[PDB]
Design a protein around this ligand. Sequence first.
Ligand code: WE7
Length: 155
Amino acid sequence: GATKSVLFVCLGNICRSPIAEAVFRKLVTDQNISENWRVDSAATSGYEIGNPPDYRGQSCMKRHGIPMSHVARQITKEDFATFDYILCMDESNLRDLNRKSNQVKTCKAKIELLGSYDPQKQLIIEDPYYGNDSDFETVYQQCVRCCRAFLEKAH
Ligand SMILES: Cc1ccccc1-c1nc2c(N)ncn(Cc3c(Cl)cccc3Cl)c-2n1
């Protein structure tokens, strides 16, 4: 049974958080500790529910040899009760998660910016919805650095 859990969150769960989830899953799978972890991603919004990751994100993960398979889903009340960590991308995500967390029965989760783990101090993982392939590459690299640091030692 899993003993550790992380939910990556962004606005739509189509660009940033599916990438963070996929990067993190590859780390724990390659280290044969995936059975210890629950890894997932979700949206603050219901707008994209059911949709796969953005093809720019799919292309970026294919180039880097990272498996990614996801259907967008909106965060639920249950998620605040069950996850150890909710790691989000930007200041608006953090405000939205903190507001929802204050209105549910149980908040087990520590809610933090994923970028707070970056040794290169690029705090915000910026929404690449209107962005180019370079902007997706920047997001991927932020996720690589932050996910490695989080797996090494959680705040
Ligand atoms: C369109 C937009 C303007 C300012 C800041 C963010 C976005 C913005 N980023 C988005 C992203 N990464 N993925 C999907 N969408 C579609 C969407 C819309 Cl149009 C409206 C409410 C929620 C969502 Cl999810 C995004 N919209």
